[PDB]
Ligand binder design. Structure first.
Ligand SMILES: *[C@H](CNCCCCN1c2ccccc2CCc2ccc(Cl)cc21)CC(=O)OCC
Length: 375
């Protein structure tokens, strides 16, 4: 079979070029109004195919700049706008999570929310088509709905561990004596909201014979049922840029890496293929502070750290042992450099992180995170 790298090349080779399109797609935007200006332009074009042309974006009438770099800035700027929870379209999947899901109440304040989601889909399809990344990460059920993959109980674990444990208990044991009913209770605004799960659900006891249906219905209620129109509108915009049978060569994890440049960063594999300079070592106390700092960093900041030291967002295939610099192969390297009062600097070409010798873990935490907040 094909690994992710071979799948991506296979994918790009089928994404054949349009020639019935204007060769440039021009859009002029003002930074203060980048979302409305982008929405009116992208939702206004004749054919979605116009968005496949080379992007020529101009911000605030700033003339004579690289049309490739400003495109990358636009994708970042429009991502922070589209995925802002204050707009009511997307929301955080949980108070303790940073992953996003579609807000079920998206329509309450946005009567026109369905065209907004189609716009977000077009932008997402544009990022994939033009080889650019979106800034934002969604729950795994989001990527699976894009691929028409069924939402399973395992997907609940990555979002809510305590309810996943409860549903896994139900699956593994006879739940009849608990007298569970085909209803769902949700805690919103200090009040219980009961929702039967099928007609007459309050009178239907969850037994061994119907629990698979029960779990399925709970899964749909949590991730699918209240967002089907928003997701359909998003997919409609996305498939206007990427044919939906082409996207299906990827699984959910590959798709997230392709769209948003994100995934799990095995901190171990990072550790074993790390080299040290000028007195540092694996057992050195600053180094073991560095590694537990990275351990307790969220999955996004682990990525932003690698970008800071490498200069790229992706992890190389087969792990960190095949990591490359600018003049050939080079593993990840931490060097003693400087004095405790300075912030770490990274050298792009040699994948080297010049780390000052910090006198405390909490100091290493802050002085390291402040050097990455500007990436
Ligand atoms: C409900 C408030 N609804 C916000 C309006 C929609 C958001 N916009 C937008 C936002 C700022 C400036 C301009 C626009 C233009 C319209 C548009 C098009 C496309 C997209 Cl993706 C967004 C917008 C929020 C609420 O009540 O709950 C807050 C959590």
């Amino acid at each position: 079979s094909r690994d992710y790298k071979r799948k991506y090349e296979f994918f790009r080779r089928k994404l054949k070029k349009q020639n019935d399109i204007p060769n440039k797609f021009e859009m002029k935007l003002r930074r203060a109004t980048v979302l409305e200006d982008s929405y009116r332009r992208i939702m206004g074009v004749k054919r979605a195919d116009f968005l496949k042309a080379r992007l020529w974006i101009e911000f605030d009438g700033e003339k004579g700049l690289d049309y490739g770099g400003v495109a990358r800035e636009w994708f970042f700027l429009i991502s922070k706008e589209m995925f802002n929870p204050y707009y009511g379209l997307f929301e955080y999947s949980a108070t303790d999570n940073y992953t996003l899901q579609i807000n079920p109440n998206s329509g309450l304040c946005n009567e026109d929310h369905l065209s907004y989601f189609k716009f977000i889909g077009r932008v997402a399809g544009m990022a994939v088509y033009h080889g650019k990344l979106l800034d934002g990460f969604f729950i795994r059920p989001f990527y699976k709905m894009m691929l028409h993959k069924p939402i399973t109980l395992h997907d609940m674990e990555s979002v809510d561990s305590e309810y996943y444990n409860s549903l896994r208990w139900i699956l593994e044991n006879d739940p009849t004596e608990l007298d569970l009913r085909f209803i769902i209770d949700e805690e919103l605004f200090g009040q219980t909201h009961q929702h039967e799960l099928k007609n007459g659900g309050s009178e239907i006891v969850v037994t061994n014979k119907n629990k698979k249906e029960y779990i399925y219905l709970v899964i749909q209620w949590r991730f699918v049922n209240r967002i089907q129109k928003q997701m359909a509108a998003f997919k409609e915009g996305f498939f206007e840029l990427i044919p939906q049978d082409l996207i299906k060569i990827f699984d959910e994890n590959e798709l997230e890496l392709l769209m948003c440049g994100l995934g799990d960063v095995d901190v171990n594999d990072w550790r074993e293929h790390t080299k040290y300079k000028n007195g540092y070592s694996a057992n050195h106390q600053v180094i073991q502070w560095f590694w537990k700092a990275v351990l307790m960093m969220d999955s996004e900041k682990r990525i932003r750290l690698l970008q800071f030291v490498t200069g790229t967002s992706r992890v190389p295939m087969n792990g960190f042992a095949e990591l490359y610099g600018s003049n050939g192969p080079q593993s990840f390297t931490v060097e003693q450099w400087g004095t405790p009062e300075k912030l770490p600097r990274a050298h792009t070409c040699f994948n080297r992180l010049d780390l000052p010798p910090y006198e405390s873990f909490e100091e290493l935490w802050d002085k390291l995170q402040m050097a990455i907040e500007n990436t």
